[PDB]
Scaffold this active site. Structure first.
Site, PDB file in Angstrom:
ATOM      1  N   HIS A 275     -78.399  46.605  -3.346  1.00 56.05           N
ATOM      2  CA  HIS A 275     -78.758  46.306  -1.930  1.00 56.05           C
ATOM      3  C   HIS A 275     -77.839  45.291  -1.245  1.00 56.05           C
ATOM      4  O   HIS A 275     -78.011  45.064  -0.031  1.00 56.05           O
ATOM      5  CB  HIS A 275     -80.211  45.904  -1.824  1.00 56.05           C
ATOM      6  CG  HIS A 275     -80.573  44.585  -2.374  1.00 56.05           C
ATOM      7  ND1 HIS A 275     -81.216  44.448  -3.589  1.00 56.05           N
ATOM      8  CD2 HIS A 275     -80.525  43.348  -1.813  1.00 56.05           C
ATOM      9  CE1 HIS A 275     -81.520  43.167  -3.764  1.00 56.05           C
ATOM     10  NE2 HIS A 275     -81.069  42.475  -2.701  1.00 56.05           N
TER      11      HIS A 275
ATOM     12  N   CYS B 122     -81.721  36.720  -5.194  1.00 55.48           N
ATOM     13  CA  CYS B 122     -81.155  38.028  -5.635  1.00 55.48           C
ATOM     14  C   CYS B 122     -79.764  37.797  -6.209  1.00 55.48           C
ATOM     15  O   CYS B 122     -78.916  37.023  -5.649  1.00 55.48           O
ATOM     16  CB  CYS B 122     -81.228  39.131  -4.582  1.00 55.48           C
ATOM     17  SG  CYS B 122     -82.948  39.657  -4.276  1.00 55.48           S
TER      18      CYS B 122
ATOM     19  N   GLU C 247     -80.249  49.848  -9.456  1.00 50.64           N
ATOM     20  CA  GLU C 247     -80.110  48.628  -8.591  1.00 50.64           C
ATOM     21  C   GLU C 247     -78.989  47.718  -9.085  1.00 50.64           C
ATOM     22  O   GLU C 247     -78.895  46.586  -8.580  1.00 50.64           O
ATOM     23  CB  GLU C 247     -81.467  47.924  -8.461  1.00 50.64           C
ATOM     24  CG  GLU C 247     -81.554  46.975  -7.273  1.00 50.64           C
ATOM     25  CD  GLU C 247     -81.237  47.583  -5.915  1.00 50.64           C
ATOM     26  OE1 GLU C 247     -81.322  48.833  -5.774  1.00 50.64           O
ATOM     27  OE2 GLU C 247     -80.826  46.796  -5.007  1.00 50.64           O
TER      28      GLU C 247
ATOM     29  N   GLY D 117     -83.186  34.722  -1.391  1.00 60.41           N
ATOM     30  CA  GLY D 117     -82.054  33.873  -1.810  1.00 60.41           C
ATOM     31  C   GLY D 117     -81.839  33.851  -3.322  1.00 60.41           C
ATOM     32  O   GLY D 117     -80.807  33.306  -3.743  1.00 60.41           O
TER      33      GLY D 117
END
Ligand SMILES: CC(=O)N1C[C@H](CO)[C@H](c2ccccc2)C1
Length: 181
Positions: A41, A148, A72, A146
């Site tokens: 992402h 990730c 992911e 914040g």
């Protein structure tokens, strides 16, 4: 404070950079040579900022399992003038559950942050932001915006990167040795 934080610190101080895309600042784990990982992402493009240096992206691959399901994890090869310490021997070979993990973050917003998240479950399937995702680890810590890209470690192993949360639980994508052959 203890051997968990010791291993986490050793990884943060040599194997992380601050990555900036149009979607934000992320903790980015360097794995070997000029190869790093970041949550998919982050939407990595042809150019990324690495510790505020404009850097060409030589390759970027959004990983999916052999069910064609999102993992992911994006693997990025950077046009950087320096190699990472090779940490592939700290990666698990198989899907697993873990005790006593640490989530470690380093950004402009959260420098030198270490969170003892405790027991890590092999959760498996998660609908992450509407996207079916496999190989998810879960921990019972109220993680926030914040974190990730944050690195999940145990003593001796680098087991995943933080990709989301639901306000009470946090979720990481697994790192496996087979991703970096
Ligand atoms: C990616 C890297 O750090 N390099 C430095 C060099 C010029 O400063 C090239 C470049 C290529 C594209 C944007 C910025 C830099 C490659």
């Amino acid at each position: 404070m203890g051997p968990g934080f010791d291993f986490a610190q050793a990884i943060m101080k040599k194997n992380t950079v601050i990555a900036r895309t149009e979607k934000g600042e992320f903790t980015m784990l360097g794995v070997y040579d000029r190869v790093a990982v970041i949550p998919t992402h982050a939407s990595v493009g042809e150019i990324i900022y690495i510790n505020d240096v404009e850097t060409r992206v030589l390759d970027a691959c959004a990983l999916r399992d052999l069910t064609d399901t999102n993992l992911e994890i994006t693997i990025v090869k950077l046009d950087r003038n320096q190699k990472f310490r090779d940490i592939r021997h700290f990666l698990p070979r198989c899907e697993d559950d873990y005790n006593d993990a640490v989530l470690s973050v380093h950004t402009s917003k959260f420098p030198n942050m270490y969170i003892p998240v405790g027991q890590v479950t092999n959760y498996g399937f998660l609908n992450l932001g509407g996207t079916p995702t496999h190989r998810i680890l879960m921990y019972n810590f109220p993680t926030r915006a914040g974190q990730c890209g944050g690195v999940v470690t145990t003593t001796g192993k680098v087991i995943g990167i933080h990709v989301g949360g639901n306000g009470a639980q946090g979720f990481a994508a697994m790192l496996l040795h087979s991703y970096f052959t």
